[PDB]
Paper text:
Here, we report the first structure of the Salmonella [name] transporter carrying the clinically relevant G288D mutation, solved by cryogenic electron microscopy (cryo-EM). STmAcrBG288D structure was determined by single particle cryo-EM to a global resolution of 4.6 Å. Furthermore, to minimise structural artefacts we decided to pursue the determination of STmAcrB in a native-like membrane environment, by utilizing styrene maleic acid ([name]) copolymer for membrane extraction and direct solubilisation of the protein from bacterial membranes. As expected, based on the high sequence similarity, the overall architecture when processed in C3 symmetry is similar to that of E. coli [name] and the functional biological unit of the protein is formed by three protomers displaying overall 3-fold symmetry. The overall structure of STmAcrB is closely related to that of the previously reported E. coli orthologue, which is consistent with the high level of sequence conservation between the two transporters. However, analysis of the novel cryo-EM structure reveals that the G288D mutation brings D288 in close contact with the well-resolved sidechain of F610. Hence, while there is no-clear density for D288 side chain, there are also no preferred rotamers that could avoid this close contact, suggesting that D288 is either in a less-favoured conformation or maybe in multiple conformations between protomers, explaining the poor density for this region. However, the residues around D288 show a notable shift, which may accommodate the increased bulk and the major change in the electrostatics of the pocket associated with the increased hydration detected in our previous work. In particular, F610 is positioned further away from position 288 causing an increase in pocket size. Through these changes the lower part of hydrophobic pocket is locally enlarged.
Numbering used by the authors: 2 to 168, 172 to 292, 297 to 499, 510 to 1033
The structure:
Amino acid sequence: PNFFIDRPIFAWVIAIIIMLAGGLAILKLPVAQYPTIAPPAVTISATYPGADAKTVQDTVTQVIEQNMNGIDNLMYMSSNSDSTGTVQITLTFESGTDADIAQVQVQNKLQLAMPLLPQEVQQQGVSVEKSSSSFLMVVGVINTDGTMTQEDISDYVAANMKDPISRVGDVQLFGSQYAMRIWMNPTELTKYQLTPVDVINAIKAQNAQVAAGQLGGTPPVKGQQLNASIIAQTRLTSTDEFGKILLKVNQDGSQVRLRDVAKIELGGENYDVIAKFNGQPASDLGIKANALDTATAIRAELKKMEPFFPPGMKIVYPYDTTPFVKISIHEVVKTLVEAIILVFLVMYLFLQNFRATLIPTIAVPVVLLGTFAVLAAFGFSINTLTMFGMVLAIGLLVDDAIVVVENVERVMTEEGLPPKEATRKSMGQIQGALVGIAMVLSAVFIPMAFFGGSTGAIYRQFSITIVSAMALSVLVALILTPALCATMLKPKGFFGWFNRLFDKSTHHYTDSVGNILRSTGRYLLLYLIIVVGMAYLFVRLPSSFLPDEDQGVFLTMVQLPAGATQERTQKVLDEVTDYYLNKEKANVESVFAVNGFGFAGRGQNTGIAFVSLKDWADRPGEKNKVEAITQRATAAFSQIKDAMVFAFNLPAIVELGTATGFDFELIDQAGLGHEKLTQARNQLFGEVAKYPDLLVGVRPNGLEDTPQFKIDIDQEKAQALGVSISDINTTLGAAWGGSYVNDFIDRGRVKKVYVMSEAKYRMLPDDINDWYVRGSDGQMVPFSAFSSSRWEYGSPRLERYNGLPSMEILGQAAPGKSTGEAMAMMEELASKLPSGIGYDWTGMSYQERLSGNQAPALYAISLIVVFLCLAALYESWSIPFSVMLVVPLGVIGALLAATFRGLTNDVYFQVGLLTTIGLSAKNAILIVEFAKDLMDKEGKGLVEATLEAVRMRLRPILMTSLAFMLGVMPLVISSGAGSGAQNAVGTGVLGGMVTATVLAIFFVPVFFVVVRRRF
C-alpha cells in the first residue's frame, strides 16, 4: 500500500527488527547434515552366557514374543536369536509418536515375563533401549608405549569415562571390564576329588558382606552412653587372597587352598570382541538433540582427562562425520554469498546507478533471516536440506524487488514523474499482481505437508521453508520497496554500447514476433511435440532416492565360512590392513579393524573394518577417488580369496539401504518346522534365480546350518551311580560355558567373577574325558560312564517376525524395474508354496509400499489451486487455463539435462521441477496481467496490447531470470566435497529455466490470443 507513502522510516525499522530476530535465531537452533528422519524404533537386549540360539528361543525369547501385548502404534516386531546367548529385538512404532512413552509401555511388559526366566539372566542383564545403527561417531585409544593390552585400556576407560559420557542415545564399549577369572585345572580337582560346584559354593561364601547390627542402637538402656556400628567381612580384594580361598583339609592335616589348582587372573568380563587401530592393539567407544554441541561437549569431557592419562595413552577420532558436515555447510553458504553478489552487479548493468540497485541488495538478507526466525518459531532443525531450501528461495526473493525497481524507474524516466507519484502509479498498477503470484507459487509447496513419510518430513521441512521464505519476501516487497525508491532516488562506452545492442535486439525480436504471431499452426504443433518429448523423458527416467558421497570414511565386512576363529579371522583382517596401508597409502589415513562384531548379529566368522581417509584438499585424484578405490579393492579381494568380502561405501542415511531394493521375510504360519522353512527357502532361492530380468542379488541375510555337537545324557546310570543330574549340568556349564558366581571390589568399583575351565582342556571332544564327577558316596567318575556324543547340523541363527520363526531375503529389482513388480514376482513364486507358509515385507519393502504413488495427487492439487488463484485474479473462467500451459516448458529443460549429463532423479529433482514450474508461471503471470488491462482500460488492440505489454516489459524478465541462473551456476561449476548434492540440484533448475524463459516470450501471447479468439 501507501501507508508507507507517508512515512519513510517506519518500515526501515520493521526491517531492521526482523533481521535482528533472524539473527537471534542463528544461535538457539540445532545443526545437522540431516534431521530426524526415521521412525522411532525400540530395542531389547538379552543375554544367556554360553548356549545356542535355539536354546534361548526355546527358553527366553519365545516367552517374550508370547507375553507382549497391548502396545501403542505397534507397527511390527522383529527378533534375532544368536548362538552366543544374545537376543536383540526390534519393535518399530508408527511414525510421529513418542519413544519416551512406548519405551515404558514395553518395559512394563519385559517385566511381566522376567520371573518366568532364569536366575543367570535375570541377574545378568535385561535391557531396553532405542534404535540407532548409524553411529554418531567413534573414539579409539591406543597405547603409544605399545607395552600393555586392550583389557587394560577398557578397564581404565570404564573406571574413567563411560559413565561421565553417558550423561545421548547409546554408548557401546568393544571389549570389557576387568573381571576376575578362575581358570580351572580339572586334573588336580580329580586328584583331590572335586567338582567345581564346591568351588562355586566356597566362593559364594568366602566373598560377601553382611549386616552387623549396631551397639545399643534402637532401644538403649538406662545409663547407656554409647552407640556404634559393627562390621563383618568384606569382599576379598585380590587374586592373591582368593588364592587363600580355602576348600578342604587332608586327613594328614594338610589344607586345601585354591591358588594351587587354578589360575586366578584378571581378564575380560568377556572377550569375543577385539580391536586394532592401524593394526596396533587398542580399544574404543561408539558414541551417539544436537550434533555439534554433542561433539564439542564430548571433546570437553575428554580434554579434562587428556592430561590425566597414563603414559602411552593416545586418542583417535577414526570414525567421524562432523567436519565433513561443517565444510559442506560453509561452502553451501559461500554459494549464497556469490549468488547475491552477482545480482549486485547485474543491477549495475541495466541501472548503472550506484543506488539504483540497493533496495534489492538490502532486502534479501532480511528475508533469509526471516526464514531463520520462522524455523525459530517452529524449531524444525536448521540443517543441510532446509538450507538448500534457502538457496532455491533466491530468485523468488529477487523478482518482486527487481520488478518494483524497474516499474518506478520507467514510470519516472519514460515520463518524468516525481518519485512519489511515479511510484504510487506503478503501484496503482501492480499492487495485487504480487499477491497473485505469491498465492500461486504457494500452491506448489503447501500441498506437500499432507504427504507422509520420512520423505514426508523431508518435503515438509524443505517446502515450508520455501514457502515461508516467499511469504516474507512478498510482505517486504509490499512495505519497504515503495519508499526506498523515494529515499535515495533522485528524479558509458563500457555499457552504452551494450544498451545500444540491447535496444537493437529487442526491436529485432519483437519484429520477429509481429511476423510470426501470424503463423500459429506450426508453433502450436511444436508445443505438443515438446510435450510428447517431455513424456518420452519422464518415461526414460533413471530413478533413485538419494545420493551418497565421500565422507572421509567407508567400511568393509568380512565373512568366513561356518566354523572359524578370531585367528583365521584376524590373519585375514591383517592382510586387509596391510593392503590398505601399503598400496593406497596416500589416501588411506588410518584403519580401525575389529574381530567378532558381525553385521548379521555377532559371531566368530565375522569381522568389520572401518576406513578413514585424508583431507579433502589432498584427495583430488578422481582415479583414486572414493568409489573407484572400493571398486579396485573389490577385485583385489575377489581374486585370491577363500572367503566372502564385500568392500564398499557407507549409505549416508540411518539404515535405509537400497530403495530400489527389497527385503522379503518368510514366516512359518502353522507348525511346519525350521527345517521345512529352510528347505522351501533355499528352494526358492534356486527357483527365483530363474528370472534375472526382474530380480537380482537374491541372497539370504540369515546364515546357514552348522555342525552342532550334541552330548546326550543317559539319565539311568546317572541315577544308578548316586549322582545329581544337576551336578552334571553345573560342572559342564561352569567349565565350558561360564558362570556369574558373584562380585568383588577394586577401587570402589564392583566387578564380576567367572569360574571357567582352563583353556587348553576345554576345546575338543576328547578333552571331555578329562572331566570327572563326584558321585554321592564320593568317588570321581567319567562322562564316558554315562555320556553319548555325536554330530549334526543346526543353525546358529534364529529370527522371528511378530511371533514366528522367520527368515530373511535381501534382494533388488532390476534398475529399470520398480520394487513393486519384484514383490509381484516374489508373491507369485512363494504363495504357490505349501500351507503353513506365510510371509510379509518390512522396512523399505514395507514403508515405500504402504503409501507410495501419491505425488501425482500433490501435483493435481497444485494444478487445481493455481487454476483457482488465476481465475481469482481474473474473474475469468477462460483466461487462467492459458497460463497453466506454461508448466511443461521448463520441465523438459531439466529432464533433458539428466541425460545431457549423467544425472538422475531424487527429491532434489521433484523439487527443482516444482520450482522452475512456479518460476515460469511467475514470468507469464505479470506479462498477461499487463497485456489484459493494457487492452481493456486502454481500449487497445488485443494483439497491440500484447505487444505494448511485452515491449514495456522485456528487460526485467531477462534480468531476474538470468540473474537467478547465474546465481545457481556455481554448483554445477562447483566440485569436491558435497558437490554431489550441490550439482545434482544446480543442474535441473538451470536446465529447465533456460527453456522456460527463452520460449514463453513467444507463446504466452499466442496462448492468450487463441483463448480470447475462441471464447
